[PDB]
Amino acid sequence: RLSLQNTAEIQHCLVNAGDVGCGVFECFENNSCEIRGLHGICMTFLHNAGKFDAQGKSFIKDALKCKAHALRHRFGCISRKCPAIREMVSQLQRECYLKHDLCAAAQENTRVIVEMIHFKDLLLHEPYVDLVNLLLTCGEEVKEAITHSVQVQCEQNWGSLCSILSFC
């Protein structure tokens, strides 16, 4: 259901925007498929890569490069339907994260990622959903910290709604 003019402008951006920077994911925002936060992903994680350790910086640069390059190359003959677009975006995200060792790098900087993650951000965008879903599969201490953080902000912004949804 993605508009043809949207497809043309996204492929123009991709062939124009380089591998580095937010340029690839900047144009991907404001699309008909409503997959948002990619520009936010790049912007926030390039803010906070300095807070990440040296291995964290290496991993985050590698993941950004993988995302841009792969999402540009594999954006070929996929059907016009948005659900397929979201599925392939999630697949590319998880593939880059697993091939660049998201789990251990997150383990070294659990507090930092706790700082970036926000309840509104996970409530709004499916990318950060994929990130946190993989994060809960990246270490018992890391998943415990992520659960504590998500409970804290979820109850801050929801109150009793968060508790009643989290039955036990």
Partner: peptide, 11 residues
């Protein structure tokens, strides 16, 4: 080589 400078971080 990109003929454009991206600061790390952008701040």
């Amino acid at each position: 080589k990109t003929k454009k400078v991206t600061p790390f971080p952008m701040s």
